[PDB]
């Protein structure tokens, strides 16, 4: 296709120059991503599918002005998820911008073992939870190959995550798909927010990629 992608931010300039090789460097230093093309460059195989299209109306003096809210989940099934929620006039544009936001909001997840680690991680590391609106989602580790015991939206979010086995429990008005998916997103991103005995030792604070490679930014 046709894509030039002139980089307008320093992170984008470094990525376009090919100086950042893995998305782990972006996630580690809590770097701010504002160009989805960075995420496209780092993760070439981010699959996605629209969770829901919802018509939302505003009551004006003349008729009812209706837009559409698209709930898109993007991921690579290898420990990377993003949840975009967008509102727009035309449904196709709403889906495109929701994909854009979801790519912007990619996040890493910490898959773990239920017990007696043998192969690659199959489940989460610990129990995690999130709460959006009144919807509280509780993700609990499950034994190997136990499937994803979750509602279809949460199940498909875990599938996009790469988590193959997990138990779930949702409390509240899980009816609303955006709230449920946001709570699940909060939980799965909180999976890397739990300090664990195997994460106890301190590191040397490797210098930030835009400090060591500040020269290649700042287009002169």
């Amino acid at each position: 296709e046709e894509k030039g992608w002139v980089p307008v931010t320093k992170l984008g300039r470094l990525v376009k120059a090919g100086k950042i090789s893995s998305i782990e460097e972006i996630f580690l230093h809590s770097l701010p991503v504002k160009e989805f093309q960075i995420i496209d460059q780092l993760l070439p195989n981010l699959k996605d599918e629209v969770m829901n299209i919802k018509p939302v109306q505003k009551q004006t003096r003349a008729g009812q002005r209706t837009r559409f809210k698209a709930v898109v989940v993007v991921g690579d099934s290898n420990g990377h998820v993003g949840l975009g929620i967008k509102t727009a006039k035309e449904v196709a544009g709403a889906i495109r911008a929701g994909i854009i936001i979801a790519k912007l909001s990619v996040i890493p997840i910490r898959r773990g073992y239920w017990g007696t680690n043998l192969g690659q991680p199959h489940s989460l590391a610990t129990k995690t939870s999130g709460k959006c609106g009144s919807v509280s989602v509780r993700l609990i580790p499950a034994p190997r190959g136990s499937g994803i015991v979750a509602s279809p939206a949460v199940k498909k979010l875990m599938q996009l995550a790469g988590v193959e086995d997990v138990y779930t429990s949702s409390t509240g008005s899980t009816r609303t798909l955006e709230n449920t998916l946001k709570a699940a997103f909060v939980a799965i991103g909180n999976t890397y927010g739990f300090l664990t005995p195997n994460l106890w030792e301190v590191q040397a604070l490797t210098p930030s990629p835009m400090d060591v490679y500040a020269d290649y930014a700042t287009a002169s």
Binding site: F27, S30, P121, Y192, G193, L195, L199, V202, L205
Partner: protein, 87 residues
């Protein structure tokens, strides 16, 4: 974190706050990483050699960022008696 044979399966072993030992989230868009330049005998800032402190977004939001940095710099011999361990 560790596979049974002994190879790492974790990705991006995360940083931790240098003042509260709490990990830094990937999307913790309040946290900062300060660099303090090493100084040689005649006061010339040696380039490319410094010391880094990762301050979390939580302490910055609370308002204890500057105090924590004061203590942390005093411990590693940067500032003279700027922070007293007994308030």
């Amino acid at each position: 974190m560790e596979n049974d044979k002994g190879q790492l399966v974790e990705l991006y072993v995360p940083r931790k706050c240098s003042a509260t030992n709490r990990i830094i989230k990937a999307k913790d868009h309040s946290s900062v990483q300060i660099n303090i330049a090493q100084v040689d005998e005649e006061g010339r800032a040696i380039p490319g050699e410094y010391v880094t402190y990762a301050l979390s977004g939580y302490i910055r939001a609370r308002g204890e960022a500057d105090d924590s940095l004061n203590r942390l710099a005093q411990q590693d011999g940067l500032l003279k008696n700027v922070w007293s361990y007994s308030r």
